[PDB]
Amino acid sequence: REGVFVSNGTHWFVTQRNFYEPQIITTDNTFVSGNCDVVIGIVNNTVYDPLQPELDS
Amino acid sequence: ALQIPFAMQMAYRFNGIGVTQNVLYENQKLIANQFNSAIGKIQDSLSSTA
Ligand SMILES: *[C@@H]1O[C@H](CO)[C@@H](O[C@@H]2O[C@H](CO)[C@@H](O)[C@H](O)[C@H]2NC(C)=O)[C@H](O)[C@H]1NC(C)=O
Numbered sequence: 001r002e003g004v005f006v007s008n009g010t011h012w013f014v015t016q017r018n019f020y021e022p023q024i025i026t027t028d029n030t031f032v033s034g035n036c037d038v039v040i041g042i043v044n045n046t047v048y049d050p051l052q053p054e055l056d057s
Numbered sequence: 058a059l060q061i062p063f064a065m066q067m068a069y070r071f072n073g074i075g076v077t078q079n080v081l082y083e084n085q086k087l088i089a090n091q092f093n094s095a096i097g098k099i100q101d102s103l104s105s106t107a
């Protein structure tokens with residue numbers, strides 16, 4: 001939604017474009033459009049869903 | 058000068074005009090082809106219009 005995806009070599013994070021401030025990638029940081037077969041250079045990772053732990057417990 | 062992939066640079070350029078970056082990424086080939094054709098048209102104009 002804002003910022004870019006970065007990787008320190010082992011983990012992927014999202015951070016604002018003008019200042020390194022890594023955050024866990026969640027559904028509140030990103031948006032969904034299309035699928036994996038269209039975007040050139042898309043990488044595999046996981047997106048944390050803040051709702052899941054609230055309903056699991 | 059902070060290196061950035063050109064496609065991501067264009068993603069920022071698109072966000073700056075109110076067009077969500079997924080439009081760029083989904084249409085990256087079309088946009089690149091339109092850019093190359095526009096450049097070719099610039100070449101033809103400069104080579105033909107005194
Ligand atoms: C990339 O970032 C991740 C996330 O912080 C790092 O993983 C952590 O590393 C520290 C040690 O520096 C551990 O104490 C944490 O438990 C790790 N957390 C997880 C979730 O793995 C990772 O080490 C970083 N990689 C580099 C090369 O710095």
Ligand SMILES: *[C@@H]1O[C@H](CO)[C@@H](O[C@@H]2O[C@H](CO)[C@@H](O)[C@H](O)[C@H]2NC(C)=O)[C@H](O)[C@H]1NC(C)=O
Pocket residue numbers: 043044
């Ligand atoms: C990212 O993950 C997807 C699956 O989540 C990978 O897609 C697989 O691609 C291989 C190669 O054609 C297929 O044989 C598999 O069947 C695909 N998976 C599924 C679930 O259909 C994709 O290749 C991965 N990309 C990278 C760069 O790791």
Ligand SMILES: *[C@@H]1O[C@H](CO)[C@@H](O)[C@H](O)[C@H]1NC(C)=O
Pocket residue numbers: 040041042
């Ligand atoms: C980046 O370019 C290299 C070749 O220099 C290529 O092997 C690699 O797959 C490319 N990655 C992406 C995401 O386009």
